[model samples]
Target: DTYKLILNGAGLKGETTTEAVDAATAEKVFKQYANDNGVDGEWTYDXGTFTVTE
Candidate 1:
């Protein structure tokens, strides 16, 4: 099943993906967002839901 990439609790709340993706792809996608935005901290993934921190 496809996953929804939700950016929650990190001062950012939204879905980055236009369409749902698989977990492996979601991991990469979420990490890229964090890296691009200079997000420094740990992020967790559960069913494609995640959050960032400073």
Candidate 2:
């Protein structure tokens, strides 16, 4: 159940966060990403939209 922030279509594309942190941070990361790119950013959090990885 680990988590990570995955960038999409923007600067990162397939890039991810430096490392996975707490779930709170997970949500914050995705929410932040979503705010960064709103065109079609599916990186939204609070709904599993946030990506979780190793």
Candidate 3:
């Protein structure tokens, strides 16, 4: 399944990947995004979407 990484708040929204990935890779992508953006917020993965709110 394909996964999407969504960033909400601070005027940032609908940030997703171009390539397809599996469940494990999806979380890794999420972590990378979190680390890159320095967002220490709530993270949840559901329905092939990784959501992080700040």
* Top-lDDT structure, candidate number: 3
Q: Assess candidate 3 and give its TM-score to the true structure.
A: 0.70
**Decreasing TM-score order of the candidates:** 3, 1, 2
Which of the two candidates, 1 or 3, achieves a greater TM-score against the reference?
3
Report the Cα lDDT for residue 21, model 1: 46
**Candidate 1 regions off by >4 Å?**
1-20
Clashes in each model (backbone N, CA, C under 3 Å)?
0, 3, 0
lDDT of 3 by residue, 1-54 (tens): 668888875456767863555788778867777778767678887888788897
Taking the tens digit of each residue's C-alpha lDDT, what string does model 2 give over 1-54? 456555565444554543355677667666666566652544345533354222
Candidate scoring better on TM-score of 1 and 2: 1
Model 2 clashing residue pairs (backbone): 3-52, 4-52, 4-53
Q: List the residue pairs that clash in candidate 1.
A: none
For candidate 2, the clash count comes to 3
In candidate 3, clashing pairs total 0
Pick the winner on TM-score between candidates 2 and 3: 3
